[PDB]
């Protein structure tokens, strides 16, 4: 359940590509509020 | 309200990130740490 945030803000100038990188994990944020583990594919901002 | 054991106290210069504690050697025993309250880098020998 203890959902785990992991969030990243990166700067953009590509078309449908993206670029590589090296370690593991760090949550920005960790806070256990009780959810289940089965998506993540970053969310919207829109107009 | 602490892990005590043994050692000197040690200042070590170590970069941890806010969200790690412990530390880890070839054998997966603990060396570095981070103070619970001030924010200090140590090791254990």
């Given at each position: 359940?203890?959902?785990?945030?992991?969030?990243?803000?990166?700067?953009?100038?590509?078309?449908?590509?993206?670029?590589?990188?090296?370690?593991?994990?760090?949550?920005?944020?960790?806070?256990?509020?009780?959810?289940?583990?089965?998506?993540?594919?970053?969310?919207?901002?829109?107009? | 309200?602490?892990?005590?054991?043994?050692?000197?106290?040690?200042e070590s210069?170590?970069?941890?990130?806010?969200?790690?504690?412990?530390?880890?050697?070839?054998?997966?025993?603990?060396?570095?740490v981070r103070d619970?309250q001030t924010l200090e880098i140590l090791?254990?020998?």
């Open positions: 359940g203890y959902f785990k945030i992991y969030s990243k803000h990166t700067p953009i100038n590509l078309v449908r590509d993206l670029p590589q990188g090296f370690s593991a994990l760090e949550p920005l944020v960790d806070l256990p509020i009780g959810i289940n583990i089965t998506r993540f594919q970053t969310l919207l901002a829109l107009h | 309200n602490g892990l005590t054991g043994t050692g000197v106290l040690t210069n170590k970069k941890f990130l806010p969200f790690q504690q412990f530390g880890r050697d070839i054998a997966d025993t603990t060396d570095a619970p090791d254990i020998t």
